[PDB]
Amino acid sequence: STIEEQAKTFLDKFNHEAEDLFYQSSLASWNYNTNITEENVQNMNNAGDKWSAFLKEQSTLAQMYPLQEIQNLTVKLQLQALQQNGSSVLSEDKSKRLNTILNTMSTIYSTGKVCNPDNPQECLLLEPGLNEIMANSLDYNERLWAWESWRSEVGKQLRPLYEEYVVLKNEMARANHYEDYGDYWRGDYEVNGVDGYDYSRGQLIEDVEHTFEEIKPLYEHLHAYVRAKLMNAYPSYISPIGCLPAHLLGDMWGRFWTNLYSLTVPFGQKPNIDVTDAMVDQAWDAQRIFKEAEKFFVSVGLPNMTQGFWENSMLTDPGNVQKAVCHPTAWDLGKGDFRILMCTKVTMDDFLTAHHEMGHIQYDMAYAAQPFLLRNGANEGFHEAVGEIMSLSAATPKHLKSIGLLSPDFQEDNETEINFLLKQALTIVGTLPFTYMLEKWRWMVFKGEIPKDQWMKKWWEMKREIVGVVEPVPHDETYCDPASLFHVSNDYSFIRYYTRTLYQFQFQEALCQAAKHEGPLHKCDISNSTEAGQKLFNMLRLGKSEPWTLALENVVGAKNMNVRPLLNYFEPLFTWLKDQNKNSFVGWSTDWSPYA
Amino acid sequence: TNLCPFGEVFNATRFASVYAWNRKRISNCVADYSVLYNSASFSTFKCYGVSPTKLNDLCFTNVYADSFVIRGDEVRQIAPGQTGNIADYNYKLPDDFTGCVIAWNSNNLDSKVGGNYNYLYRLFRKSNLKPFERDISTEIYQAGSTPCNGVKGFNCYFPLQSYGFQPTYGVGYQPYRVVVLSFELLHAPATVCGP
Ligand SMILES: *[C@@H]1O[C@H](CO)[C@@H](O[C@@H]2O[C@H](CO)[C@@H](O)[C@H](O)[C@H]2NC(C)=O)[C@H](O)[C@H]1NC(C)=O
Ligand SMILES: *[C@@H]1O[C@H](CO)[C@@H](O)[C@H](O)[C@H]1NC(C)=O
Ligand SMILES: *[C@@H]1O[C@H](CO)[C@@H](O)[C@H](O)[C@H]1NC(C)=O
Ligand SMILES: *[C@@H]1O[C@H](CO)[C@@H](O)[C@H](O)[C@H]1NC(C)=O
Ligand SMILES: *[C@@H]1O[C@H](CO)[C@@H](O)[C@H](O)[C@H]1NC(C)=O
Ligand SMILES: *[C@@H]1O[C@H](CO)[C@@H](O)[C@H](O)[C@H]1NC(C)=O
Ligand SMILES: [Zn+2]
């Protein structure tokens, strides 16, 4: 028997063993997340520890089959993934040091507390204390206090840990034959050995920067309009040509500009579409919300939910005693077990969230027939891109009128379209420079292009230049402001939110064309279009079995990430923004700062 | 008026594992086949060669009842000319099979929260099964070229795997009880008629 035949048999054993251990761990994890008890924490840890130990052993066994002797690409994909990063390429000591560093940074972030001057007992966590200030307060000093105190007391703790974290991650990545840890992260998009669909790790940097250049004009005009509106609210704090102060952006970091809508809404006399009252008037419950979401996916030709989904999911908050983690999640336990965990309320937001989460489920069901190791999105940005486009269609006035939640007499004028698109841009477009700049800084740090004594100097130079955001207080190299965001201190790659944003509008434009939609892209509803559902399903069933470039081509007809559908979606706003900024300065100077 | 003991096959407390599938020879009795086909309790009732519709008007020398448990998605493998882990390694039907395949969902009996590891199937074998062959061996499968010495190791796997039936599984992974009826015709007494 050849080496390839041995690997096929080895993967045959792994799949059945992994499916069984993964189901026990997910079941144990589900029981804790729905029923928080000390006994359930131990059972989750016990099952989870066996699952991790099994993966560590199987990864070592997989490394005894060299990839150089395998010709079947589907076999090589599964073998390579399990070869993962190996069962720690570093020494046991360095792996132990790295794991303690990761745990300490996570604990500092989740338990970091800030106390108001003159009362050392009235202290606030980030969630919900500091987040509430940054999202709702209009007071300049209160927002500044929360923004600076978080970085000066929690970020400074993370600075020495992050420095050692970079060294150990690069050692692990370089011993895995990557240039650095950033190059390791970019490997999620790498494709080899498929003629016409290959993709290199370095190509991701080029494509992200190339597409970001085309985003700049839209972001510049959104930045100018937002600055003008904020300057009216805070006349003595904002320069007409300068960057936006970092603490006046709607959350702790300015990752999203969503909470700036109240101060920047174009037409403040036209209310939002809020069908929450109509849902309560018709006595909707959580089951009705998920029944309507199920009908939406059936209308495009996708299967209905399994019987186990309705029996085993938790679609409402359990009660007053039995506690549960209420973060909405879609669960793929394997063995045909698909569930949604959600503490659903009768609101428009939860109605759209159900469509988002059931979109995850449809993706999970579609590639269930794939081998265990290929049961995932084509790349890290596919899954949430699929989930986002479901809420796009479900939220349109056209869809809300067909299900009886929006009255037919209600008609939409171009002022409500501008209001809606501006709100969309604050969240979707506002995060793109933030996401790209943050990951570029981490890529350069891992590359070694930024020395340690210039981490914060470079961090705020790039914030001013790329994001048009300026720090309100000078920060020396005792600060670790990037680590004050969850993803940086908890070791999560961040470019996935940039690529996913471009994927979702590529998906939506292709599906809406297959649905023969007429008019602006943002008004489209793919409901009742089996042509759109079939085109999406052709990609969903692939899982990870094919290169993401091919999986993308199945939906949109193109092999690469493209920014034109994003700009097509926001074109009515872009035209409106350019007219609004005729009397305003567009762009920003990087030398102005609020601390003069 | 000796009635064929079909209750002992269909209503057994525990079924056999598919790799060790059970066979019950039925002889010298009266079989009311129409009761089974017109009971509406089975999800699968497919007959090959013979017709389920009122063909209890025929006589056979011997009738064999093979019973075992598999998962729902593997029921399609109990049919002539099928491939897969069950058909190739556990239970094989011939191309010219004359008989009926009967199956029904048994999630209420063969599933248990935490996992029911009583039912096994053969995952590896050197070659495919001949029709109606049974292999209950526990020899360690040699996937490589180094002898296994009778214990698991690198390229050395225990050939039998477990379903681990839990109640929350999807239908395709839930346990199904299967009864296969073979109708033999020799130049012989023909002792099983069954009006
Ligand atoms: C890679 O290997 C898989 C399985 O090892 C091949 O798929 C099998 O194809 C045969 C027919 O040639 C089917 O009978 C099997 O059911 C298939 N199994 C699976 C798991 O798909 C696949 O064709 C191989 N690919 C290449 C390019 O050789
Ligand atoms: C919650 O968990 C406990 C054990 O920790 C268990 O006894 C109890 O039945 C569970 N309750 C529910 C509603 O699942
Ligand atoms: C799903 O649809 C199928 C028809 O294809 C039907 O048989 C089944 O009962 C449906 N299940 C649910 C939960 O709606
Ligand atoms: C979908 O089709 C039904 C008829 O099958 C129709 O009543 C409904 O209005 C349609 N909805 C949309 C959004 O096209
Ligand atoms: C809405 O349409 C009217 C009619 O053409 C136009 O005058 C107005 O400027 C439009 N509002 C916009 C584009 O915001
Ligand atoms: C199994 O038991 C049920 C209920 O007693 C009965 O109706 C059925 O006929 C039995 N099965 C057979 C094969 O006799
Ligand atoms: Zn999601």
Numbering used by the authors:
A (entry chain A): 19 to 614
B (entry chain B): 333 to 527
Question: Can I see the authors' text?
Answer:
The binding of RBD to the receptor hACE2 is an essential step for virus to entry cell, thus we first explored if the binding of six SARS-CoV-2 variant (including Alpha, Beta, Gamma, Mink-Y453F, Mink-F486L and Mink-N501T) RBDs to hACE2 were changed in comparison with wild-type (WT) SARS-CoV-2 (the first strain of SARS-CoV-2 which was isolated from a clinical patient on Jan 6, 2020, GISAID: EPI_ISL_402119) RBD. Given that residues at positions 417, 453, 486, and 501 are involved in the interactions between the RBD and human ACE2 (hACE2), it is important to understand the detailed binding of these novel variant RBDs to hACE2. To further elucidate the molecular mechanism underlying the binding of these SARS-CoV-2 variant RBDs to hACE2, we prepared for RBD-hACE2 complexes and obtained five crystal structures, namely Alpha RBD-hACE2, Beta RBD-hACE2, Gamma RBD-hACE2, Mink-Y453F RBD-hACE2, and Mink-F486L RBD-hACE2 at a resolution of 2.9 Å, 2.6 Å, 2.8 Å, 2.4 Å, and 2.7 Å, respectively. Each complex structure was comprised of one copy of the RBD-hACE2 molecule in one asymmetric unit.
VOC Beta (B.1.351 lineage or 501Y.V2) was first identified in South Africa (SA) in October 2020, and has rapidly became the dominant strain in SA because of its high transmissibility. N501Y in the receptor-binding domain (RBD) of S protein is a common substitution in Alpha, Beta, and Gamma strains, and is often found in combination with E484K and K417N (or K417T), with this combination described in the RBD of both the Beta and Gamma strains, respectively. For the detailed mutated positions, in Alpha RBD-hACE2, Beta RBD-hACE2, and Gamma RBD-hACE2 structures, N501 is located in a loop structure and could be replaced by a Y without creating folding problems, it seems that the N501Y does not induce a large conformational change. Some very weak hydrogen bonds are possible between N501 and ACE2, but the phenyl of the Y501 side chain could make many new favorable nonbonded interactions with hACE2, i.e., a cation-π interaction with hACE2 K353 and a π-π stacking interaction with hACE2 Y41. Thus, Y501 significantly increased the interaction between RBD and hACE2 compared to N501, so the N501Y replacement in this region of the interface should be favorable for the interaction with hACE2. In addition, the E484K substitutions would seem neutral or even unfavorable because it is far away from the RBD-interacting residues of hACE2. Therefore, Beta RBD and Gamma RBD exhibited a higher binding affinity for hACE2 than WT RBD, but a little lower than Alpha RBD, consistent with the SPR results. The deep mutational scanning suggests that single residue mutation K417N or K417T is likely to have minimal effect on the binding to hACE2, and that the E484K mutation may predictably enhance the binding, while in this study the structures of Beta RBD-hACE2 and Gamma RBD-hACE2 indicated the mutations, K417N and K417T, decreased the RBD-hACE2 interactions while the mutation E484K displayed little impact.
